[PDB]
């Protein structure tokens, strides 16, 4: 039922699978066309009985990581970042004796030609 509902996007509503056959100019042709399409849809849906791999996956609206998790983004590589910053302050101080305005591209950010 899940697989058939997914395959019949708007063809199923309120528990009734409905198919309007109007391809041909004759109702005698449209009955055959609709019968064939129903049989094909049912056959493809029954693939869900072969194995779990044919059971359609469920779409769950998974949230983004919460604020608590996002907080640790500041602490990832905390010790290494502290070491790098203390090392870099030396370079910043040395550069301040040559230029009025020091630049992140001068200290750590890589801006090349």
């Amino acid at each position: 039922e899940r697989r058939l509902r997914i395959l019949a996007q708007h063809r199923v509503g309120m528990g009734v699978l409905k198919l309007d056959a109007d391809k041909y100019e004759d109702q005698a042709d449209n009955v055959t066309f609709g019968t064939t399409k129903l049989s094909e849809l049912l056959a493809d849906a029954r693939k869900a009985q072969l194995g779990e791999e044919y059971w359609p996956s469920v779409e769950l609206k998974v949230r983004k990581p919460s604020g608590q998790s996002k907080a640790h983004y500041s602490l990832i590589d905390n010790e290494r970042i502290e070491k790098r910053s203390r090392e870099l302050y030396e370079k910043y101080r040395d550069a301040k004796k040559r230029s009025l305005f020091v630049t992140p591209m001068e200290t750590w950010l890589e801006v090349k030609g």
């Binding site: 129903l38 049989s39 029954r46 693939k47 072969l50 044919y54």
Partner: protein, 104 residues
């Protein structure tokens, strides 16, 4: 007009109204066509009743027309032999096989 009281019952349907405005200084005149639906629900298919129902258009009232809607239960077979269930092929279809003019 009550399904509980009589059989069959008549239910009302919105009249088809087509207004047209045209030069005369302008005039508004509308074509109108009123409808009424007679519903008969039978717990069996009677081709005799279908015949006597179809034969109404011959003594229908003056300048009145009628159309017939039939919803009947019909048995449909799903022949699993002509329409079988198979494992999804080794090389699956891609979007190229469902391209423009691919249906032909």
């Amino acid at each position: 007009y009550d399904p509980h009281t009589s059989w069959p019952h008549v239910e009302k349907l919105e009249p088809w109204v087509r207004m047209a405005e045209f030069w005369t200084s302008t005039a508004h005149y509308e074509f109108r066509k009123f409808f009424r639906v007679i519903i008969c629900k039978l717990p069996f298919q009677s081709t005799e009743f279908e015949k006597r129902m179809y034969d109404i258009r011959h003594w229908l009232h003056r300048q009145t027309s009628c159309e017939f809607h039939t919803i009947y239960r019909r048995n449909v077979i799903h022949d699993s032999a002509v329409f079988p269930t198979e494992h999804d092929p080794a090389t699956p279809t891609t979007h190229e096989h469902h391209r423009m003019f691919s249906f032909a």
